[PDB]
Design a protein around this nucleic acid. Sequence first.
RNA 1: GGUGAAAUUCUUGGAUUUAUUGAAGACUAACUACUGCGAAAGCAUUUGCCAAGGACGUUUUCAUUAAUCAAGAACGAAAGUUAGGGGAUCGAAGAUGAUCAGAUACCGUCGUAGUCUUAACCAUAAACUAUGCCGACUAGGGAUCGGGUGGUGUUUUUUUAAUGACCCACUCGGCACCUUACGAGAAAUCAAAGUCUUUGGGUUCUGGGGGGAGUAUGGUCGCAAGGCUGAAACUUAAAGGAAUUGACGGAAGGGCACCACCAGGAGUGGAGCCUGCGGCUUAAUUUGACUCAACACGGGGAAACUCACCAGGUCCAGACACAAUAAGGAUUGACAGAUUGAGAGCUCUUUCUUGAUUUUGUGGGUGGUGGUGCAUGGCCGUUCUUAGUUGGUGGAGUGAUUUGUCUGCUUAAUUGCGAUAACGAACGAGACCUUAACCUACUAAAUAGUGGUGCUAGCAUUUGCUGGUUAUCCACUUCUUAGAGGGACUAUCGGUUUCAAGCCGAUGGAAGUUUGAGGCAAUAACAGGUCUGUGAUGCCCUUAGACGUUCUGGGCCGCACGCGCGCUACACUGACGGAGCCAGCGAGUCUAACCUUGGCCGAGAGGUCUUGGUAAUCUUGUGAAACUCCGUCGUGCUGGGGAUAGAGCAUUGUAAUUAUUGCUCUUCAACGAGGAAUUCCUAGUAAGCGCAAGUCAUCAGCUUGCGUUGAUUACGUCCCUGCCCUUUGUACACACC
Lengths: 125, 65
Amino acid sequence: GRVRTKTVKRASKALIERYYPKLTLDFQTNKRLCDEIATIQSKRLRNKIAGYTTHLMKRIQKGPVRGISFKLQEEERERKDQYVPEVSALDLSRSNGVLNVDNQTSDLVKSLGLKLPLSVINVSA
Amino acid sequence: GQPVNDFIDTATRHVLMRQGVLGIKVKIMRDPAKSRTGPKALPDAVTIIEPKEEEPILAPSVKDY
RNA sequence: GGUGAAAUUCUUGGAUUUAUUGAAGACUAACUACUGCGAAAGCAUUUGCCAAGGACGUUUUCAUUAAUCAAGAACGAAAGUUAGGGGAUCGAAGAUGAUCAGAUACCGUCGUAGUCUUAACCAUAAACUAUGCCGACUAGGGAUCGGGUGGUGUUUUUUUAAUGACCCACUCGGCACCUUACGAGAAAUCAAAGUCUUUGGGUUCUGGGGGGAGUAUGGUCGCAAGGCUGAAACUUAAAGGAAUUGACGGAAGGGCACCACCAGGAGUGGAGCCUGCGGCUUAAUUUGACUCAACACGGGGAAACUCACCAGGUCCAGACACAAUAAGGAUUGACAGAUUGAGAGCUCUUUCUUGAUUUUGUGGGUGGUGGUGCAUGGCCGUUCUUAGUUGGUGGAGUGAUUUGUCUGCUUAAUUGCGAUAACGAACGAGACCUUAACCUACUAAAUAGUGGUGCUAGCAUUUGCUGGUUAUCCACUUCUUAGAGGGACUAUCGGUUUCAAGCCGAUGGAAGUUUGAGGCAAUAACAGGUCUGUGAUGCCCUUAGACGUUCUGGGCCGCACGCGCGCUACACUGACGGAGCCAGCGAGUCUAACCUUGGCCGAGAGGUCUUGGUAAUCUUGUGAAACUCCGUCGUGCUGGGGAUAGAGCAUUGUAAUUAUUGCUCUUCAACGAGGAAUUCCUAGUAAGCGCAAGUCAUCAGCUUGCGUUGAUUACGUCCCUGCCCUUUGUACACACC
């Protein structure tokens, strides 16, 4: 019956969301830090909040936890997503400069498109 | 629980009408923010002090006097 | 055999079982499907005749020959009109055997009419798709059956060829199916149940609230059962359809609970007693409460009081307004005697006093533990030891309503992880508060202790041990106290899960079940209890010979009997006598006799003289009890048990008889471990044991707490009794009593 209530969980998630580079991975200085940077009425509640807060970083440093963005996980993510490969995936260099479409695509570009380097593949059953 | 003793106040009054007696029960809670003595918030209320942002480089050097 | 169990029945005359060989008895098990044919009823292994049919193909033919149809016909599920055969599997009936209160039923065994003749049904079915037939249009999709068309398709073999079978595409015609809802509908739902108040394609049949009633009567078919046709009198305010929310189910799924069980423990129900309830009795045996949720409950352990009941005796404390008597006296009180339970001037004899406040009448006032808790307020109990409850905005539906408030996993928890036509919230839970655990860390205590120092005792003597010394003095807070704090958050590690919420194991820790236990505690409700707690109260009653109030006695306790909560025992793990001696929660008196130390007297109960205490100071270390040694007892209703009863001594009380209670001697009953039933309980717990407080003047076998000793058994399940959620059925909504 050690399930934490939503009061502990929402406060601990709110603490990590804005105070990641101040808390460590041990409960002793985490409960010491929560006395100044947070206002908790009872000693039993702040021990439960700091205990769950330390438990949350027992897996945050293990891997990215869904639903928590702690001001450190953000800026390496909008650093990562501008993946510009040095070569394209649609420029015909791993091929011989010619894309190997089938017969039905050849008269498609013959009817409406302009002349391009194509091949003919006998695709069937 | 204990917040009922702190913030909740009650009064019971018997009025006398023609048909009999009507009972009046009034329950009022004041918000704990205006409380002068005792706790100033609910026991399950947690407030987070907003942190102050800092710039990353901070120009490594020494200043003397 | 046969059944939930059994029984009927057959069995050395060999049952049942095994083999071989025969003979009569629907139909065609598997194949068998959201597949085919037929007008419907209906029709399944073959093979052969006899006619029939749909669909497709068609540059064949007729040319309106058609659609629906009163009258009129044909065809037909099965179950018995009637007349041969063959031979029971099932039960009508019938026989039996069970079950049951009965069981003429369900279930078991057997068996006649009863889907096998050849020959009629008058023609009845929930004969159903509960949906007439013909024609046109309106929307997408994938399958499938029959036919046809096409493929520089596959396979079968001669190499490909011809077929066949398969694959792709299309088309016609079918049995259907899936998605939406433009559209319909009251909704359920529906590609028709659409194209309908923007109401007309053609046509046939039926209905006009529920019954009476498919009845009466007439006809007709009818050797029969019975069909087909078919009213009225009278009666009635609903009957009915679909859906929503609850409740319920001998419905299903998921969980939970020692007010459920499991495994056990201690018991209760058996005995004596005392304590409530009923019944009986009585002058009265006051009364409320009757499953959980009445019955050691009304804080209800009643001698008077309480007290509401009974037999009697007083008093007005009936205020005020009006009227009348009335300073030639409105009225009150009383000596003595009578009277009275009575030293009540109650009332009377007598004659004193008082005097304008009183008396009488008219209105009212007041009081009532008089009635109504089914007129109410407040309080409490219960539903309900569970986790549930509700707005806002948005979505669905005509609407009641619904979603949010949930598939799954997890939790003690609607606790969370999450998924999501919901998002964001509120109450409940949790959080919180109190108490018990840890602190050689702080704050310092002659109203708590500790060590040394002085004085002094006993032994040893060697410098030691056990003490005493109200403050002799000094020092400290480990023990005790109480302020502020700290500490646990499941910490660390390992293992499991979707890799999360979590769960389990180990270590460390005073503490790992929410740390143990409480307090508090939702929305809605009960004709739950209380008018006998209240100067809380409406309405009704009474109000002077009072239902007010007071006083004297009695009753609440009365006992052929029944029930509930308990106490003491049935003995040797014990009784009795000495010895050791070990706690915690608390209470205690200024104008009043409270808790009582100590000294003396007494067998005891108790008496007497003082003292301390308004209290961490004194009672008090409450020197409690079970417990532990040593001894007596010796398997015997015995020395277990102390019920019942007799005599005496004391205490409280105005009063003790109907024994208040305490003590002494004697009397020495039932009871030999308690049937059906039934209660409570998972760790400092049950159980054993006593102590303080409430009530108290006296009485505790009761209750609220406390400490002493201290276990067996589980770490589960829904089997019994209940509870929460989901699905489901409902003719229930006073809600399965």
